[PDB]
Task: inverse folding
């Protein structure tokens, strides 16, 4: 996952988490505007190992952390499927749940037989039980750090998003929280690209000087 | 119940099953138009035993028997509410259902706590369990004779509908099936009125001549 | 457009309007049940000149005339497009409508310029004017004859329906009204198949005796 | 207007443009959390000149400038209602619009009568004409400097919002652009409050030290 | 603010103090009738700077200066609510008031327990303390010149009233008192409109001739 712009000499590769610091406010604002307008503008080009350019639908742009909606139909559906798989991995728990559902179905079936009208039903499944329970992620009481962590956790659930990008999101988190975000990103394998006007101390990042020189920085 | 139109001299009473034949095509088509437009048109009237006019919401008009869906939002709502009332009439059974739902919620809650992502849940309700089970009336109908029987069952189940009316629905059923439908209507006590362009032989019916005079038959 | 059942020796062709009378109540009710269940049952087979069997989605079945909804999104959309074409066929009327729309757009544009906020717009078209007018067919005060006539008029608007079929719809209409329906069906070129238990006098129809013998009948 | 939190000794007043710098990352992130949760949390308070608490509906919180859509049900509804009121203030212009709409309705009605299919219509209204024209605020923004200006225009247009708050939005704009934004805020009289993790040189701002003491700068 | 009637060619604006003289007795009496009947009659209209019609509830019409009571149920309600809001703006003072009220309630409760008859009480509230104290505007007026000043003070205090109108109230005040009333109106910024049958010498006023033409004076 390499990204390239006219200011860079060679296309820079983005693997796991990547912190890109732009010291020039003009090039930073122009780069962010090229991030929002990416489908319209040909200046900023992001391509994969196949050199194929990714569509704006495949690109995930995030600026406001608390304003973004983490709960979607596809995210909640795939999450319910993941919970159903977790319950399916254990035979004993699945057997017990099947027993309880069998009892409830017996009770409701008796209540249906007591009625005068002829009634028919099918089954009460686990996905229908999770949908009836209303399982969803809670962003209401979550701190910004837990919100970004939940976004990194649900990025694997999003199928269509090729790369996640954050705009000036590193100013809220402490250095230790940034270390936890990067260390978790290395395990999640997702491609995250952070854009900050000022450099963060203690973390590896790519610095773009006002001279338009891109250099790697350990601190 | 009685129905009154400006063509009849006096309002005729409809009790249990009733077969009404209209020998005039213009009066029959205009009568069906008055049935669908009953809310708009004041010509056709219906007076019950209380001698009170009834709204079109209380009149059930069914022309196509096979095209009438037995499962509807209001029917499923009243059925689910009825089952919820039956389950609410027994405290012990509902208590056991609350215990089982509590166990399932504890298991799914433990599995949610085992996940690395934060999860928020509300609760599970008996109505959500009935809707999740998909409780509905039987949709299996082999012939129109059985479908009309299901329409009579759902009609007798609905308290709001005071009358059920069929338009030219007797042409599909055989004379013996018409006898079984009349006997089932007399056993169910529901009020059913049929409208046919031509007379049917072998059964009692009210024949409306082209002269507009109404005469009983059999 | 030929239809075939086990009772018939050869498939009967349906061209323009066709009146099919079944004197047996058992075969008539079984044929209607095979009309509603057509996708499930293989007994009744309707095929075109290509011998390809038409899907139930391509088949249009109609029993209740006044209960059917003639107003649909596709029917109203294609009807608005037809009205737009009728207005486009006349250059003078289109020019006058363009003039009036130009005047209204001038007034609204002046009102927008009077406001403090910067406002932008595009155009007011003819399709948007028809959609704002709410043009639709009125079945409320229509008689059953006018309802069936409007159904024969909107059958050309329906793209997916291959053939229209009516179940016992000829009992309401007088002989003259049936002659008008057939004479209009010959001009509309649509394929309509009527199913009646009793034969109609004065019109050409295919009669099926209780002996299960199919014969053409002039009266 | 003034804002008050447990960290401050006394509530600080926000008049015209205001720049607030928080030198503590925990107090800044917790402050933004208190901004999004303001409805839920009672810690952060806002007291106007009337010394009355304001609901979260009256507070406009905008973090992403480019990601904030200008067009919305309340913005287009209030705008279309405003244009309808402006057209209603002049009887003659509205009368001419009614005449032209009557002519167009007569033409389309004649074309409908020319068709062989029955057609039913209701009427055409000025609101349907504005919605049909697609009246909306200009969506063209070349840079974030212009987009923030449009946000200030729509904010000054909205009477319900008593305050506009930007979180870390000053990092995109140059110092000169910040001066132009402050001058435009002083000319527009609107109340704008900015929250920055680090201090900005050359402009007047309130610096909150890690010791929690607040001191003015420039 | 502007007022418009069928007699005027164009609506005249009323800003700060305004003196309107009507040289026709029929147009003056019919104008006052249109003032009292303004809710019933649509002839007389009033358009503010927003060009929006105002209800009669927003128009304050005062003819008799001495006969107008300054203390009213709505005025005392808004005043008591205003004092309650001022006391609610300070938590410490309201806390001390709650402490003193708790002490008095403890003393009176002890005296009630000392009695042989059972006694039930609820509580004491700040609103009941203000109403018990009888807080009201000053009712002392030596002359109509001071009473009109109190009417201007209460009018400037009331936000709902957008205009104050006096009918033939300038005949009581001397020319110097009229100058002081105009200067006080310009200092208070309130909109006041006077209606006089005859012109007043020495002050600027709008003269409406019997020909219906309106001309400025001084
Ligand atoms: Ca639930
Ligand atoms: Ca199910
Ligand atoms: Ca309309
Ligand atoms: Ca448009």
Result:
């Amino acid at each position: 996952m390499k990204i390239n712009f006219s200011l860079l000499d060679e296309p820079m590769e983005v693997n796991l988490g990547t912190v890109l610091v732009i010291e020039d406010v003009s090039v930073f604002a122009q780069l962010v505007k090229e991030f929002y307008q990416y489908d319209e503008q040909s200046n900023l080009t992001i391509f994969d190992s196949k050199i194929r350019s990714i569509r704006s639908s495949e690109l995930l742009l995030i600026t406001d952390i608390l304003g973004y909606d983490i709960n979607t139909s596809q995210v909640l559906k795939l999450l319910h499927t993941d919970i159903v798989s977790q319950l399916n991995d254990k035979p004993e728990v699945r057997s017990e749940i099947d027993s309880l559902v069998s009892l409830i179905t017996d009770i409701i079936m008796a209540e249906c037989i007591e009625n005068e009208l002829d009634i028919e039903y099918d089954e009460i499944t686990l996905l229908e039980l999770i949908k009836a329970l209303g399982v969803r992620i809670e962003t209401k009481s979550c701190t910004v750090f837990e919100k970004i962590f939940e976004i990194l956790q649900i990025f694997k659930y999003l199928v269509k998003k090729r790369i996640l990008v954050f705009v000036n999101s590193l100013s809220y988190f402490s250095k230790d929280e940034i270390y936890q975000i990067l260390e978790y990103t290395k395990l999640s394998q997702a491609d995250v690209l952070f854009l900050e006007p000022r450099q963060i101390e203690g973390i590896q990042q790519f610095i773009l000087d006002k001279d338009y020189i891109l250099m790697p920085y350990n601190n």
About this structure: Chains A and E do not touch (no CB pair under 8 Å). Chain A has two domains: 1-72+135-218, 73-134. The first strand of chain A starts at residue 2 and ends at 4.
